[PDB]
Symmetry: D2
Subunit: 462 residues, 4 copies
């Protein structure tokens, strides 16, 4: 009643978003269990959280969990295509500041982040940061150092964001401590792998409705995202080849039943067209990038790809594919939103019945979020239960209030303790109806653990 501190595509989508939020709550037992567990204690009372992460239905349940535990938030998406407008509307209609819509320009994207940082044209009294990819974190360090003075910590969602934090720590420019939410096992080995298993072929089907069975796929990378992506395609019947620079991950791809290939002859990428294995790329129907790296689907690869192959990226940033080359040289025909035909016959105009094109999804942005709805609620449950625990821990540490000498001892990038990782996992398992066995005292003694855990040494890889 009188609330205008937001900007979304269409506020009238709020009732629809609320119905989906109520469904999503029943799919997120770990997150909803934290709501019940900590509601009375109000551990986030006084927290003022700047949030930058895909404004999906799942992020909506996270936001309302943080608010239910006492926090105030100002929110934006971390990607121009990842917002679900009904989710953003439901949040704005709850009186929560959110600046996000599907299909933002790059200028609107930066504007939205700035609207969370500033309130009434001045720095909001923020004291916590929740980030996904590091864009909000970077803007605060470069443009608002005075705000970081009063911020107790950053909780970072994803592999790329964590790498940017560690680079800051290395160079001595990180100003506040952070929790690496990515490397909880109930995040990295749930979200990053199983989420892409669910949502990759989902996005491809919604964007193209292509049959995948019997066709040839090339997955660039075999980390957590590349493992889930390769399984997403293989389980549909694709013939999947895997490329990697890490021989250990390549070993896993071989033992997992994939043929390991390189886009470059003998894997040497010397920048020439002669280095391209034209015969291999000429047979690929679908290429997916999963690396977090730069230019792993390059211009010479794009020139050599089979006619009408689908090109997409599920890493965090669109620079995995040389889309800039494609904008400079090839004509773009929009099929529908986030689906473009790229005509390799020239830059000026195209023949509507030309057969020499590629199909680009989400203009190279995160394809699961751009062309579908990203990961499902029951997977994001794990990641976002970790987020809430990480927020609680850093806000209770109160780094911004410590003496300079104590700040120096706590300026670090840490992960959550394994006991909490296990506690999130148990709620997830109970959500499936799974029944964990309890050790007897003798069994716990035999393997050297407490009956209640943790059950593995910190070196354990699962």
């Amino acid at each position: 009643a009188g609330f205008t501190d937001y900007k979304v595509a269409d506020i009238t989508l709020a009732a629809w978003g609320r119905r989906e939020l109520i469904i999503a709550e029943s799919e997120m037992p770990a997150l909803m269990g934290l709501r019940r567990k900590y509601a009375g204690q109000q551990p986030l009372k006084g927290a003022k959280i700047l949030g930058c992460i895909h404004m999906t239905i799942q992020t909506g349940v996270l936001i309302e969990t943080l608010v239910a535990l006492g926090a105030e938030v100002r929110w934006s998406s971390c990607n121009i295509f990842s917002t679900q407008d009904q989710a953003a509307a439901a949040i704005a209609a709850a009186g929560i500041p959110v600046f996000a819509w599907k299909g933002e320009t790059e200028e609107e994207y930066e504007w939205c982040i700035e609207q969370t940082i500033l309130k009434d044209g001045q720095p909001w009294d923020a004291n916590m940061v929740l980030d996904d990819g590091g864009d909000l974190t970077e803007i605060l360090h470069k443009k608002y150092p005075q705000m970081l003075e009063r911020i107790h910590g950053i909780t970072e969602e994803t592999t790329t964001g964590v790498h940017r934090l560690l680079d800051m720590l290395k160079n001595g420019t990180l100003k506040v401590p952070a929790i690496n939410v990515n490397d909880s096992v109930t995040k990295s080995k749930n979200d990053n792998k199983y989420g892409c298993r669910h949502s990759l072929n989902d996005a491809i089907k919604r964007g193209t409705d292509h049959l995948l069975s019997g066709k040839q796929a090339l997955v660039i990378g075999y980390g957590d995202v590349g493992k889930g992506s390769s399984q997403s395609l293989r389980q549909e019947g694709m013939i999947v080849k895997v490329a990697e620079v890490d021989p250990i991950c390549a070993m896993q791809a071989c033992m997992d039943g994939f043929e390991v290939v390189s886009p470059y002859k003998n894997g040497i990428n010397d920048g020439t067209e002669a280095s391209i294995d034209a015969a291999l790329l000429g047979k690929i129907d679908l290429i997916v990038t999963t690396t977090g790296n730069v230019n792993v689907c390059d211009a010479n690869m794009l020139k050599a790809l089979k006619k009408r192959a689908v090109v997409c990226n599920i890493g965090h940033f669109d620079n995995e594919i040389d889309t800039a080359f494609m904008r400079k040289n090839w004509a773009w025909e929009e099929v529908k939103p986030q689906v473009h035909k790229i005509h390799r016959t020239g830059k000026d105009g195209f023949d509507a019945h030309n057969d020499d094109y590629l199909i680009l999804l989400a203009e190279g942005r995160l394809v699961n979020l751009g062309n579908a709805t990203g990961h499902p609620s029951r997977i994001m449950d794990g990641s976002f239960a970790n987020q809430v625990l990480a927020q609680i821990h850093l806000f209770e540490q109160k780094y911004a209030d410590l003496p300079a000498a104590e700040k120096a001892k706590r300026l670090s990038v840490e992960v959550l303790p394994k006991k909490l990782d296990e506690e999130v996992a148990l709620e997830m398992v109970k959500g499936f109806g799974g029944v964990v066995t309890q050790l007897t005292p003798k069994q716990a003694e035999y393997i050297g653990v407490s009956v209640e855990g943790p059950f593995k040494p910190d070196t354990y890889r699962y």
Copy 2:
């Protein structure tokens, strides 16, 4: 070959030529191990090394032994399981003039005697200076019974999850006398051997022991660590309906996402000791139970009493006490079908009816079923583990821990893993053995993700 060679004990020396044929095949399946032979033979990095080895005397172990020998070492060898030896492997090694004391179907007395034959030479302790172990039994005998021999030993290289746990317990208690390398926790060991090895060899052993159809039947896998993961896949890929038990909620979460139903043998997961806590309806529909935990009594007497008639029971963890076979020896009549396959008749202890329908089938008497009823992991998988073993031996032997003063010794008494760079190089040779082609980072790409073009490519915290 040495004239008059008698310093061995095997089942049947006439199997030697057959064993040699299989070793030559296995060499073509083990490019990382054979690459270490070619690369290091001239330098002789193990010259002067005198290695006590205790690990399953398979064809794959034969290639490992002859690699150590080719790099300059002398060895004296036993198996770390009474059923895991391949008799043609042991014969080929003995025929090559290498002291080996190992055969399939040892008694427990014979098993202990075999280890002692490696420790002793001509009635007196051998002047060993290196130890290679799998499960910790030889490590334990040396510490317990021959502690003075440990004064000359530079290191232990331990193969498997259970052995590493025993070493860590010793280290924390101040009873470990020499440094050790945890070979198990190389990624090219743990996440290759322990998982993929069991995927290959669990259904292999069950087929060879029973020739049972697995498709369409119900399986319960106890444990979902690396071995439990590999075991569950071995059975699911055959078409079994697989249920998974775990005490670790993170591993249970993985089982759920992997498409398994997670269940407990005990109502609400609580074993209160009584029969009333057994989920009898669940156990009464299980056709196959596999233990994978490295823990004790995870398939207990009450579970065995409740299992569906004619269910198969087996253990693929390191030690047989995962199943309470002692209870079954005490109370039920055992009918040998063929070696390492027993029908266990739940009608009573004394006799059994030849046509009784109420029995279970126990494989390998509860010992590691993949090595007991088949041949364990395949050569191309053991290549990774045993390349790590060779590199661990070279590193510790060149360190010369036993030659340091007591002060410097306290500084290096540790249990270490091999560095990731070496893990990656082992993996690269494995990938090349499949004909896989690894891509090389450009300089700009390596700078972008903060790695060297030559690796390592991941931080030490990375879990793969």
Copy 3:
């Protein structure tokens, strides 16, 4: 041109873009265009068509038109139309009456609009049907029109069953080709198509994670086999129900547990017959039978809270949706997704936890909540449709003497050689390379180098 009714004609450009893509995914169908365009085998044909107005059906329509036919088209399901496909077809001057989200009355009206042109019966002479509704209407309401029609080509299992019942009863008036039982239709479309589109529609409707959850698939025919695989490949724990013990045997061997909703499989009408413990653990039930009431009122009452219920058989009476309309309160989440509150009939609590999620109001879920089978699968089905239309039209049954008609009134299938020729074009679409027998090899197994390679009894 105004002889059409669609949801939004301005979607036509979008529809045309997706048709141009679809043509690249349908090599058997496009090969028929190139090879028969010269002959124009369908010149003078006037086809009444009733099949899901999808992008895939658009390529079928334009193939028939390319070969000389005129058509008047409707969808065979109220939720299966893709509005951009209907628009593109209407914009090309082809009469079509079809939109997504028709009422039952509008569905009947749409078919009537193909049958009638300017208030009078169109001079149709061919029928292309999917499920038999159009066939039924012509026989019951417009029987004199059937005197000019040379044949019916029927797409799907349910519709073929209806054709055979009329044949047995002596009420079928024109010959028909059973398109369903070409191998490149039944064992491509019915199975592999549902494998692609079932989990697709469930994700689009609910965005639920499927890995780790319990599914019950009722039926294990071709649709049940594909549906079960759609779910198992996602990591669902899939149980299968069947009344056919051979199909049940296949489910066991395929690695599924075979269960019945009823104790000992005996459905005696009582709630006591329901296996409440089994149904209380099921997160998703999918009906695939073509039978009636295989997910009945007592099962719906026993289902786990918040289970998803859906049907991928042809008709929406596989689930007792009428029971739910009469007794429980429906809350629309979004189009074709309803929460069904088991707390009562009049009103519901927005936060009630005791509900079921019904997809597409019990109608064909793959077409209702997604886009049905992909173009490359529908290629096989629709190539058979074209060949069957050519064959029946050139036989000219309506022009035969009465004695010649009696010998010609049957339900037949396409010869295996044509089935194999369709398959070869599909294989080449994947880049597959079929080996050619040597003369000695052909003689050794008793086939021609040209094929057919299997006897008509072979089951593949």
Copy 4:
């Protein structure tokens, strides 16, 4: 003093009996027939010549036929497929059996002759059970007078059925036959799932090779090729499939396999130049599944990747050109039914030569040659069909019919669908599955009887 047999070692009988008793518990359809028909004795007076792999599973089939009243004289239909403990148990039961693992071609022939002749004269046979048609062929060629008194043939396998159909075409088939192969509880159980179980089984037993990550080429994608492809893919092999039948190739593509031909553009013209050398040089394992001749030929064998495994799971060994390899290359036995073929020449070999192939079972049926064939619970379906087929033809008494009535009954038929369904039901109950019963309204709605059959005869499953 029973001596009317020949087996490898009669002292293996007790071990064989232990395994028969287990197999009985794995074969509920077959044991169900045993219990249902024992008192009626429907095979009393039946005297069966049987020629089929002398496995434990065949042992249960034999003793079921005997339990229902039949007398039999048995041989194996393959030189490597007998399980010697199974043969010993049968012999020790007083049942004439002539079979051991590792026969020569001469011994194979002699064993079939020992079933046909008793005490030097033709046995008073009146039924035939065959697998592959060798016994059927010997009777037609050499013992026509015996066929005058024989009521029928029940033939197990695709290749044997093809040979029956050629005889029927040519007017040379002398007695009616039941095609047991084309029951759904046989062809789409045994041929497919049986090879799924036992192909990777035999390869592991023969070589202990890791299969995950390696490249396989399966020739054919019928029932056996489908099961064989799954056997390898589920182990993590990268599987390519070859086919001449584009419908079967279509299935392979849709099932997620790349379909390739050993020959460029699929044209097998007999030249080395027509071989896809790049493809063949990548293959670690080739498996033939066709029932055809020379589908893994000499030019394919010359082009294969060094140390590739070569094997055949079709009925006969001429699917691979082993004759070429015997004539040109040096054979090194690794162990029984495993040979390295050194492509360096014929006159000897280097023990450390790297250029060899591994051939399993000398090109004979690999699942039976290098392991134990299909598991009991799968053979349960095939062999329940065999028992029912024997009962049906023996009760028809074709040999006693007048000449005009023989003409009307001389045919190759399959068992009716109702029997096929009842077999399947016992298999399903053996898994603990629960089949649902149609209501009367539901049976009326789909036009079937509540008890079945549930499908028209044209249904393909």
